[PDB]
Design a protein around this ligand. Sequence first.
Ligand code: NI
Length: 341
Amino acid sequence: TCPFYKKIPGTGFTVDAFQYGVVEGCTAYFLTHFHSDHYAGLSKHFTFPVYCSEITGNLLKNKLHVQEQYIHPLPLDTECIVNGVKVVLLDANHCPGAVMILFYLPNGTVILHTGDFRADPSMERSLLADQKVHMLYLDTTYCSPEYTFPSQQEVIRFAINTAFEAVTLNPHALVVCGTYSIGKEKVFLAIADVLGSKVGMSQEKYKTLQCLNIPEINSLITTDMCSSLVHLLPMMQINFKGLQSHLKKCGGKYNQILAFRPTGWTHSNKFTRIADVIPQTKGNISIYGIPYSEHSSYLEMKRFVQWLKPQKIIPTVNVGTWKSRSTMEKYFREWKLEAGY
Ligand code: NI
């Protein structure tokens, strides 16, 4: 049964609620983004209207085979009417196709659902600037002050400089990047651009990337592993055993691997600067964990909420324990007292 924080009051709508069967009273199912914890339950047998971004709707049709007649893609930054209710989709700064949803209820209440997001000051100049928001359904993934990480731009600068140095020292080194979902494509695309290479990958991952409307993508990715010196592998294979095995498969073209695991936060964030990050190494294999996040840091989250000044906050992440819920509520009250709303 569907939890209350997935239901939009005063509407027939749910958000990211496909794993509960037929939800009583739902007339339209919204999907914020194509990550499995959010789409869990969708398939070719789904017969209710799904509302989403264009990119999300490409992934539903090609990867999950949802029939076309039930996919309702909406343009971003555009007022649309859905079952008698005005809505707007906004870029969430998460993975490709990810959106936040603004609902303008018939009684005058305005609700923002962030989906998954990485808050940014650029959001302060979207269509959010123009009216008051009463209720915020918030991605609270990293809602505690210990969660610090660098900007995405600093992390990509480190990755490109690290890869370019290694491969210039040894032209026979292969670069490998881990993946298990969409998101974080800048990691492998930026590294392949500095090296003058396409990115090589499985047919299943190439298919996924071809749904994403990335400009000039045919110029950047390939299924011909032998022509590429940046390879994508499943995240589970980014360990010394899995990388040794991969190196065997390359037929003596390469004699070294430099591998990247883009994680979110890890407790090595509480001590070390990005500049000072070092790899784990075993023989001719080196593995870097890099803190590339597609969710808000604590400070980014706090800035957004203190700008928006919502009357009520509903967390959507970390809701299963009393300790987590009490911690989050204490920070919300702090933010409100500091800012004066
Ligand atoms: Ni997500």
